[PDB]
Design a protein around this ligand. Structure first.
Ligand SMILES: *[C@@H]1O[C@H](CO)[C@@H](O[C@@H]2O[C@H](CO)[C@@H](O[C@@H]3O[C@H](CO[C@H]4O[C@H](CO)[C@@H](O)[C@H](O)[C@@H]4O)[C@@H](O)[C@H](O)[C@@H]3O)[C@H](O)[C@H]2NC(C)=O)[C@H](O)[C@H]1NC(C)=O
Ligand SMILES: *[C@@H]1O[C@H](CO)[C@@H](O[C@@H]2O[C@H](CO)[C@@H](O[C@@H]3O[C@H](CO[C@H]4O[C@H](CO)[C@@H](O)[C@H](O)[C@@H]4O)[C@@H](O)[C@H](O)[C@@H]3O)[C@H](O)[C@H]2NC(C)=O)[C@H](O)[C@H]1NC(C)=O
Ligand SMILES: *[C@@H]1O[C@H](CO)[C@@H](O[C@@H]2O[C@H](CO)[C@@H](O[C@@H]3O[C@H](CO[C@H]4O[C@H](CO)[C@@H](O)[C@H](O)[C@@H]4O)[C@@H](O)[C@H](O)[C@@H]3O)[C@H](O)[C@H]2NC(C)=O)[C@H](O)[C@H]1NC(C)=O
Ligand SMILES: Fc1ccc([C@@H]2CCNC[C@H]2COc2ccc3c(c2)OCO3)cc1
Ligand SMILES: Fc1ccc([C@@H]2CCNC[C@H]2COc2ccc3c(c2)OCO3)cc1
Ligand SMILES: Fc1ccc([C@@H]2CCNC[C@H]2COc2ccc3c(c2)OCO3)cc1
Ligand SMILES: *[C@@H]1O[C@H](CO)[C@@H](O)[C@H](O)[C@H]1NC(C)=O
Ligand SMILES: *[C@@H]1O[C@H](CO)[C@@H](O)[C@H](O)[C@H]1NC(C)=O
Ligand SMILES: *[C@@H]1O[C@H](CO)[C@@H](O)[C@H](O)[C@H]1NC(C)=O
Ligand SMILES: *[C@@H]1O[C@H](CO)[C@@H](O)[C@H](O)[C@H]1NC(C)=O
Ligand SMILES: *[C@@H]1O[C@H](CO)[C@@H](O)[C@H](O)[C@H]1NC(C)=O
Ligand SMILES: *[C@@H]1O[C@H](CO)[C@@H](O)[C@H](O)[C@H]1NC(C)=O
Ligand SMILES: *[C@@H]1O[C@H](CO)[C@@H](O)[C@H](O)[C@H]1NC(C)=O
Ligand SMILES: *[C@@H]1O[C@H](CO)[C@@H](O)[C@H](O)[C@H]1NC(C)=O
Ligand SMILES: *[C@@H]1O[C@H](CO)[C@@H](O)[C@H](O)[C@H]1NC(C)=O
Ligand SMILES: *[C@@H]1O[C@H](CO)[C@@H](O)[C@H](O)[C@H]1NC(C)=O
Ligand SMILES: *[C@@H]1O[C@H](CO)[C@@H](O)[C@H](O)[C@H]1NC(C)=O
Ligand SMILES: *[C@@H]1O[C@H](CO)[C@@H](O)[C@H](O)[C@H]1NC(C)=O
Lengths: 131, 251, 131, 251, 131, 251
C-alpha cells in the first residue's frame, strides 16, 4: 500500500535527535568514566519534506500503532528490542528460505552477465570448427 | 496485520513488509533498519495541559509494555506528572531502571496534584505511546518527562542549542471530567489555567507578575484569574491587576 | 530421528490456547486502555490426532527437555526469548553460510527451468544455420 | 545434543534440526517457528495433590531460569502454593514482574501449609517445567497458578466456555516423606485427603457436607475421615456421618 | 586489518573456562534439582600460542573495547545478549541481501561443477549429429 | 568503527567484519560465533591492590551497561570490594539478579574500608570491563568477585584442580591520591601493605606471623611494618619482630 497522510496538520520539517553509535571517538571520550553523561550522548539533524518524506513518516508511525500495540499485547517481554532483527531474518527467509528456482519470480538470482558467458563462449567450438 | 515497514519506492514513502519486497530492493545490513519515534505535536494535536491530560486515563488488568526506538523528534511540549490520591498514596509507578526522560523538550509541563486514579496504570486513550529516552511505553511513569508519540519502522536506502524550560502546575480532580489547573508563579501565587494559554504566554505572564510586583505579599494563597478579554495555531508555523484563599482578576 | 511416544498414556486431543498476535482488531479494541485485560487475550482451538501428531508432540516436548534444560543452565539470561530466532538464523547459515556450489547436495539452487532455457535456445544458432 | 526441532515428513512428526533439513523443506517466515507447552497431564501422570507435590523438591545453588512459549494446553489440574516454614518465613519467592498464572485451569489446587523447605528454590524432581502465562520456569513462585509441563519447538508447514474452580488444602510437613493434607470445606471443617480423591469427588463431598449440614457448629476444628469403603483413570477418557480437634468418620 | 600486539607483556598460554552447553548428560545430571550448582557447571582447557593466536586474541579484545563501549553507550538494553546474533544476520545480509549476480565478486555462487555439465553435454548434439 | 570480529586468515588472527569477508570464508552456524573475555593480567598490568584500585574511579551521570561473554580465562588475581563512606552508607550497589562472581580466581583480594566515593558508580578509568560470571559490566558491584578484562568476538573455524584463596585488606581514603592499605592477619593483627608485596609473599608472611606467634596478644590493634630491606615480574613466567594502636617493625 501507499501512505496517505490523514492528520489535521503536518510539520513538514523534522528536527531529530539520535545517538552516534560509534562516532569518531576523540581521545578518551569513549571511556565511560571520562565520557559524556546521559544528557550529552545525542547528535542532532534537520530534515525537510523532500519527496513528502516527513509527512509520510508521520502517517506511517500513526498507522503502525495498531499492529505494534497488538504485538505488544501478545508478547511477554517487558521490553522489546528484537523487532528489527526479526524483520531482517524475515527478509532473508522470504528470499532464501526455500529452493531458489533460477529465472523464477521469487528467486533473486541474476545469471545475466554469465548467460553472456556461455552464449559467447559457444564461439570456441561452433566456429573453432576447423575442418 | 503485521508490523508495517517503511520503504522508499518511486520517490515516495510507502508500507511494504519484507514479503512484499521486490528483488531489486536490497538490504545489506541491519544498519539500514531503523526504529523512529514521531511526536503527536507534528500532527496538530492540542498541546496545552488541559487538552493533553484528557487523552490519558487509568485502567487495571493490562500489563505495561515497552518497545525501544533509536531516533526521536525534538519536542516543544513534554509532560512530567506527580499525581497522588487524596489519601496521599502514589498514582503512578516509579520509573523502571533504565527509563529516563525524553531528551529534547523545549517546555516541560510539570503537573502536581490529586485525582481519584481509578486504575493501576495510566494509558493513552487513543492508543499512542509515551515516549521516554529511546524507549516507548504504554503507561506513564511518575515524575518522568515524556512526549506523546508513535513509532515507525524503516528500511533506509543504501546511499541552535538545547534550551529547556519547566512550567509547573497544580491540579485537582486529575483524570476526570471536573479537573482544575493552576499555573504556578511561586509557591503562593497562582493563575487559573485555561486551554487557550500557550507556553510563551504563561512565561510572559509570569514575568509580568514578577517584574510588576504582583506576587502574594502574605502567607496566603493568591490566585489570579485572566479575564476573557485577553486573547492568546501550530507552533512551527507562527494589563491591570485588581484583588477582589484570595481570588483576583487581571485586566 | 523419528519420535516414538513412550509415555504411559496419551491424550490424543489437544485443546489449546494461544494469542492472536495481530487478529482483526474490532474498532478500538486494539487500544490498551480500551482493550481486554490479561485474562481475555486468548483464543482457543481443538486439534485431533491426525497423522499421530498429538501423541508425537507430547513425546517431542518430553524429549526436548534435556537439551533445553542444559541450554538454560549454560545461559545467563534470566528469561530466554531468542531460541526460535537463532534457529531461523541457523537455518539460513546451513544453506547460505558458504559458497553455493550449483548442483551440489548442500546448495539449494534449482537451475531446472533455465537449463531448459539454454538447451532449447541452442536452436537459435544450431539450425538457424542458414547456409 | 542441540535443542530438537519438530518437523513433519511423510505424514509424520519427527525431530530434525536446521542442519538435518533437506532443500525441499522450506521456511518462509519466523511465523512458521513456534514454541509450545504440553501438560504432563496428557501423558498420564497422577494429578492428585499428594502425588503431584512429591515430584517437587527444594534445592540451593542452582539459579532459576525462564523460557517463553507461545501456545499452551488447557489444563484440568493446576497448582498454587502458599508454603511457609514453621517459623513463619516464606518458602517460595514472589512472582517476578510479568509472570502470571497459567491461563486455562479447570481445577486450581491451592495448597497452604508448612514444611522445612531445605532449599532456596523448589524445582521439579523429574526435570519438567512449571508452566505459567506463556513463560516456563524451573522453579515454583509463591501463590502463582502453574501447570506441570514441557516445551517443544516446531516448524509449521506453510499451508465450551472457560470455567475454573479453586480447591483449597492445608498441609503439614510439605516436601517431605511425612506430609499430611486436609481438604478444606470451610475454615473449621476439613477432610483428610488421600491420593484416591478426584477433583469431582472432592467437590461432591464438599457439596454433601453443606447440603446435609455437617460443617462444624462450634469454634473448633472438625476433621472428617472417609473410610476406605467409599471408592473414587485419565480425565479425558471417562453416606452416614458420625463423630467419635474433633476427628470423625464418614461411612 | 591485521592485529599487532602492542601490550607490555603477553601470556602466550590461555587457561580458559567455559560451559559445555549441551555436554553428554550423565543419567539425571541434566535435571536442575539433581545437577551441579553454579560453581560446578564449568569445563576447562589449555591453549598455546600456535600461529600467535593467544597474543593476537589479547590485542583483539583490547582493540575491541572502544567500539564495544560506544555500542553500549548508545543502547538502552541493560544487558546485551544479541551482538553475535546480529553479526550472523549481517553476515547473511552482505552476501544475500540483494540480487546475486552470478560470476560477480559480491555473489557467492559457484557454477563450476555445472558449467562442466553444460559444456560437456554439448556433445549430446554437436557430435550426436548423425547425418 | 563497528565492533571488530576476529577471524583466522593465512594462519594468523586478524580483524575482519562480516562485510570484509570473502566468499570462501564460511559460517555454517551461530556456534562458530563466540564471545570471550581476556584478563588484563595477561597483558602485564600490575595486579597488587594499590596499583589495581587506582585504575578505578567514581562517576555520576553514566548509566551502567552489561554485555555477556561465553568463555573466560583463569585469573590469578580477582577483587571483591566492600567500601562505605565515612558516614556508613554504601558506596557500591548490590549485585543485580543473575550477576555472580568471576568463576576462576587463584587469589581473591577482598578489600573493606572507607572512601569519599564522589560518584554514583565506580568505573574503570582505562575503559576496561569488570568481568563477572559470563557477564562483563562497566561498573563495580558490592561484595562481588571480579577480574579486570576486555571482550573479543570470534568466528571459529569449522574444524590441576581449582584452588582459591581469599586475601583480606583494610582501606582508608579509598579511591583517592592518599589511600592507605593494611593486610589483615586477623581482626587485631595487620601489616602495612605496599605495592611490592605479591600474593604468595603475603600468605607466607601471614603464615610466619601465626607459626612464630606474632599476633596481637591484647585487645588492641597491632600493625606490623615491613622494612624496605626485605625484597619481594609476570606471574606466568616465574626475620626479627620488634615492637616500638601499636606500630612495629619486621626486620
Ligand atoms: C492516527 O491519526 C488519526 C487521525 O488524526 C487519529 O484519529 C483520532 O482517533 C481518536 C480516537 O482514538 C479520535 O478521538 C475521538 O473523537 C471523537 C470526536 O471528538 C470531537 O471532534 C469532532 C471533530 O473532529 C467533533 O465533531 C465531535 O463532536 C467531538 O466533539 C470523540 O467523540 C471520541 O470520544 C474520541 O475522543 C480523534 O477524533 C481522531 N482524530 C481525527 C483527526 O480523526 C488516531 O488517533 C491516530 N492514532 C494514534 C495512535 O495516535
Ligand atoms: C519423559 O517421559 C518419561 C517416560 O514417561 C519420563 O520418565 C520418568 O522418569 C522419572 C525420573 O525422572 C521416573 O521416576 C523414577 O521412578 C522410579 C520408579 O518409580 C516407581 O515405578 C516403577 C514402575 O514404573 C516401580 O516398579 C518402582 O518400584 C517404583 O515404585 C523411582 O525409583 C525413582 O526414584 C524416580 O522417581 C519415572 O518412573 C519415569 N516414568 C516412566 C513412565 O518411565 C520422564 O520423566 C519424562 N521427562 C520429563 C522431563 O518429564
Ligand atoms: C589496550 O592496550 C593499551 C596498551 O597496553 C592500553 O594503553 C594504556 O592506556 C592508558 C590510558 O587509558 C594509559 O594510562 C595513562 O598513562 C599515562 C602515563 O603513565 C605513566 O607511564 C609512562 C610510561 O608508560 C611514564 O613515562 C609516565 O611518566 C607515567 O608515569 C598517565 O599519564 C595517564 O594519566 C594514564 O594513566 C596507559 O599508560 C596505556 N598503556 C600503555 C602500555 O601504553 C589501553 O588502556 C588498553 N585498553 C584497554 C581497554 O584496556
Ligand atoms: F536511528 C536513525 C534513523 C535514521 C537515521 C538517518 C540516517 C541518514 N541521515 C538522516 C537520518 C534520519 O533520521 C531520522 C529519520 C526518521 C525520524 C528521525 C530521524 O526522528 C524521528 O523520525 C539515523 C539514525
Ligand atoms: F503459537 C502457535 C503455535 C501453533 C499454532 C497452529 C497454527 C495453525 N492452526 C493450529 C495451531 C496449533 O496450535 C498448537 C500446536 C501445538 C501445541 C499447541 C497449539 O498447544 C500446545 O502444543 C498457532 C499458534
Ligand atoms: F565459548 C567458547 C569459545 C571458544 C571455544 C573453543 C572451541 C574449540 N576448542 C577451543 C575453545 C577455545 O576457547 C577459547 C577461545 C578464546 C578465549 C577463551 C576460550 O577464553 C578467553 O578467550 C569454546 C567455547
Ligand atoms: C462528567 O460531568 C458531566 C457534566 O455534564 C457529565 O455529563 C458526565 O457524565 C461526567 N462524566 C462521567 C464519567 O460521569
Ligand atoms: C516551592 O514548593 C516546592 C514543593 O513543596 C518546594 O520544594 C520548594 O522549596 C518551594 N520553593 C520555595 C522558594 O519555598
Ligand atoms: C517567572 O519569573 C521569574 C522572574 O524572572 C523567574 O525567575 C521564573 O523562572 C519564572 N518562571 C518560569 C516558570 O519561567
Ligand atoms: C501587596 O500585594 C498585592 C496583592 O494583594 C500586590 O498587588 C501588591 O503589589 C503588593 N505590594 C507590594 C508593595 O509589593
Ligand atoms: C522418610 O520416612 C521413611 C519411613 O519408612 C524412611 O524410610 C525414609 O528414609 C525417610 N526419608 C528420608 C529422606 O529420610
Ligand atoms: C477463611 O480463612 C481465610 C484465610 O485466613 C480468610 O482469608 C477467610 O476470610 C476465611 N473465611 C471466612 C468465611 O472466615
Ligand atoms: C462447597 O460447597 C459450598 C456450598 O454450595 C460452596 O459454596 C463452595 O464453593 C464449595 N467449595 C468448593 C471448593 O467448591
Ligand atoms: C452440629 O454438629 C454436628 C457435628 O459435630 C453436625 O453433624 C450436626 O449436623 C450439627 N447440627 C446442626 C443442627 O447443624
Ligand atoms: C593528591 O595529592 C597530591 C600530593 O602531591 C596532589 O599533587 C594532587 O593534586 C592530589 N590530587 C587531587 C585530585 O587533588
Ligand atoms: C573478624 O572480623 C569480621 C568482620 O567484623 C567478623 O565477621 C569475624 O567474625 C571476625 N573474626 C573473628 C575470629 O572474630
Ligand atoms: C594465615 O595463617 C593462618 C595460620 O595457618 C591461616 O589459618 C590463615 O588462613 C592465613 N591467612 C590467609 C589469608 O591465608
Ligand atoms: C605477645 O605480644 C608480642 C607483640 O607485642 C608478640 O611478639 C609475642 O610473641 C606475644 N607473646 C606470646 C607469649 O604470645
Amino acid at each position: 500500500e501507499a501512505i496517505v497522510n490523514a492528520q489535521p496538520k503536518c510539520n513538514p520539517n523534522l528536527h531529530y535527535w539520535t545517538t552516534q553509535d560509534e562516532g569518531a571517538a576523540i581521545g578518551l571520550a569513549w571511556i565511560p568514566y571520562f565520557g559524556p553523561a546521559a544528557e550529552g550522548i545525542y547528535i542532532e539533524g534537520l530534515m525537510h519534506n523532500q519527496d513528502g518524506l516527513i509527512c509520510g513518516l508521520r502517517q506511517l508511525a500513526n498507522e503502525t500503532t495498531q499492529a505494534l500495540q497488538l504485538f505488544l499485547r501478545a508478547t511477554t517481554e517487558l521490553r522489546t528490542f528484537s523487532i528489527l532483527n526479526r524483520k531482517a531474518i524475515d527478509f532473508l527467509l522470504q528470499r532464501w528460505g526455500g529452493t531458489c528456482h533460477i529465472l523464477g519470480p521469487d528467486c533473486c538470482i541474476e545469471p545475466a552477465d554469465w548467460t553472456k558467458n556461455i552464449t559467447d563462449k559457444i564461439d570456441q567450438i561452433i566456429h573453432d570448427f576447423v575442418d | 496485520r503485521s508490523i508495517p515497514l517503511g520503504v522508499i519506492h518511486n520517490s515516495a514513502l510507502q508500507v511494504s513488509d519484507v514479503d512484499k519486497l521486490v528483488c531489486r530492493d536490497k538490504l545489506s545490513s541491519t544498519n539500514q533498519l531503523r526504529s523512529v519515534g514521531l511526536n503527536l505535536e507534528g500532527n496538530g494535536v492540542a498541546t496545552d495541559v488541559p487538552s493533553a491530560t484528557k487523552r490519558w486515563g487509568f485502567r487495571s488488568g493490562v500489563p505495561p509494555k515497552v518497545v525501544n526506538y533509536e531516533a526521536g523528534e525534538w519536542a516543544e511540549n513534554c509532560y512530567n506528572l506527580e499525581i497522588k490520591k487524596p489519601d496521599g498514596s502514589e498514582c503512578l509507578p516509579a520509573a523502571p531502571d533504565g527509563i529516563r526522560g525524553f531528551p529534547r523538550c523545549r517546555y516541560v509541563h510539570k503537573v502536581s496534584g490529586t485525582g481519584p486514579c481509578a486504575g493501576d496504570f495510566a494509558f493513552h486513550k487513543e492508543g499512542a505511546f509515551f515516549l521516554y529516552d529511546r524507549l516507548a511505553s504504554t503507561v506513564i511513569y511518575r515524575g518522568t518527562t515524556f512526549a506523546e508519540g508513535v513509532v515507525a519502522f524503516l528500511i533506509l536506502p543504501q546511499a541552535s542549542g538545547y534550551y529547556s524550560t519547566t512550567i509547573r502546575y497544580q491540579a485537582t480532580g486529575f483524570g476526570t471530567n471536573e479537573t482544575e489547573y493552576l499555573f504556578e508563579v511561586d509557591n503562593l501565587t497562582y493563575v487559573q489555567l485555561e486551554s487557550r494559554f500557550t507556553p510563551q504566554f504563561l512565561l510572559q505572564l509570569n514575568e509580568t507578575i514578577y517584574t510588576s510586583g504582583k506576587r502574594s505579599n502574605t502567607t496566603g494563597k493568591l490566585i489570579w484569574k485572566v479575564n476573557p478579554e485577553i486573547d492568546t495555531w501550530a507552533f512551527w508555523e507562527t494589563l491591570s491587576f485588581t484583588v477582589v484563599x484570595x481570588x483576583x482578576x487581571x485586566x
